[PDB]
Amino acid sequence: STDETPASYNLAVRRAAPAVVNVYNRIRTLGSGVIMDQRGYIITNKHVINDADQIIVALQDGRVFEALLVGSDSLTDLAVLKINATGGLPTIPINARRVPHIGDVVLAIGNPAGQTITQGIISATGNFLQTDASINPGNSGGALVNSLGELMGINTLSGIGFAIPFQLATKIMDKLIRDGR
Amino acid sequence: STDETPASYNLAVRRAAPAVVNVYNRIRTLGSGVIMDQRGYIITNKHVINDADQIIVALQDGRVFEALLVGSDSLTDLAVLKINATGGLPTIPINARRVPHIGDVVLAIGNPAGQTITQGIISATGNFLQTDASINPGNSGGALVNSLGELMGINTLSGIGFAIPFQLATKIMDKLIRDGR
Amino acid sequence: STDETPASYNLAVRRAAPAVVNVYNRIRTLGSGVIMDQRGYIITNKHVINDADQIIVALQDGRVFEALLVGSDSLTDLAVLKINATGGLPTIPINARRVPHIGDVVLAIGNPAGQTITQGIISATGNFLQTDASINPGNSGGALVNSLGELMGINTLSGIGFAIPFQLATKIMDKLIRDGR
């Protein structure tokens, strides 16, 4: 037993969990969020930031920034936030070439802090992406990733949970960065 | 990440999901079902077909047949249906030599349409077979299969779900084909 | 399909399930328990044994002993029991060198009898250890183990379940064996 290695998805956790953050109002805990790029853009659910006097974001490595709302799309309950990149921001691994398949193992990473991670599969490929991984306020707005750590979706609320396919989330983010809502 | 392959049970989905079908009344959605053989026999739960004026079955590939009730067993809540085989029916993979073991990974495949798939293990080998895979109306009457795609059980209703061991389901089906109920 | 082997965690079940036992009052079913050593010591939840006129323990191999309460810690809801070792007691595999990581696959083994086993991962490493494996009265007081079979925690009550890290459980047990509560 000692020589052999336990089955684990910790690899995906190490690669992806650093990029998932807390999101607060100023002090209340709103929900989770995901760092998408070095520029300092962050995706979260619209309902999380719907009534925020001031928005604060907290990484797992201890850093704490203030975020400004870039914009939101009601239809997808998504919202993009912006923060100053110190130089060295942890970003969510993304693979635009990866094709999500039904039955793929997925971890739902959320940060209501500690950090909570649940495991499931893709029930139905994205309409949105379905998974039997628990999706709750604690991980709403966080990332859904495969065993590799590659972003599959953004966890959203409202036995089956829902995430927004990463391809669509990318596109919505871009269009929100350029135009606004 | 791009070079490497995600952990997935999609293999089992491709092998088994084609054989799981919808079941309707004529238009209401009754539940799920499983194609067992080329002859055109289909297992579903008795409660699904309990009050059907007319029974319709819908495959994932787009075909739609009418089904006639062969018979049912109250004790197992099972029911066998019959449809004309076009020539080329997708059937549920079965291995009579395979011995289900506790801890075996299993996918519960149901078709309330899209098609919903959940993942778990065998908690207790069949009394019936137990699994922590979600078993709900959406997948009641559908198939439970291992990572290979081999039929383990027929999902049934009434944290733990229940499926009827494929060995018993086979036997009950045969006896219903010969005698009736 | 027949040549190939199903994905399974049955290995861990065979190695660990023998050591998980039933716990009764004398006849009511109280909960689950875990055999820790050849001496005949057994960990269970304090709430399970809180009001026991007489305590009985039942192994999976058919043997039935009476147990005496060594002591308990309210804070961890743990309780150590003692039974005469026949010679050949099945004990829960323990690895003091093993470091539990987030994302590790874990089976929650409980014995409300049959024996119920559920699967999940470590959401948060132990405060206590979190897992999305179902933790219910049926498996409260039982073992949580990895794919190897190595004890990770003692399942406890009160979408996320809780287990007491095996390192802490070991220490609490020792201190209860020496002093009492």
From Swiss-Prot, chains A, B, C:
Q: Classify the protein's membrane topology as the record does.
A: Single-pass membrane protein
Enzyme Commission number, as recorded: 3.4.21.107
Top-level taxon of origin: Bacteria
Known catalytic reactions: Acts on substrates that are at least partially unfolded. The cleavage site P1 residue is normally between a pair of hydrophobic residues, such as Val-|-Val
Q: Name one GO biological process term.
A: cellular response to misfolded protein
Q: Which residues are named in the active-site annotation?
A: H47, D77, S140
Gene Ontology cellular-component terms listed: outer membrane-bounded periplasmic space; plasma membrane
Q: What is its main location?
A: membrane
Q: What is the effect of changing K171D?
A: Increases the basal rate of RseA cleavage 3-fold, acts synergistically with an rseB disruption
Its subcellular locations are:
Cell inner membrane
The record's family statement is:
Belongs to the peptidase S1C family.
How does the record describe its quaternary structure?
Homotrimer.
Q: What else is known?
A: Regulated intramembrane proteolysis (RIP) occurs when an extracytoplasmic signal triggers a concerted proteolytic cascade to transmit information and elicit cellular responses. A membrane-spanning regulatory substrate protein is first cut extracytoplasmically (site-1 protease, S1P, this enzyme), then within the membrane itself (site-2 protease, S2P), while cytoplasmic proteases finish degrading the regulatory protein, liberating the effector protein.
- The protein, known as: Serine endoprotease DegS
Q: Which organism is it from?
A: Escherichia coli (strain K12)
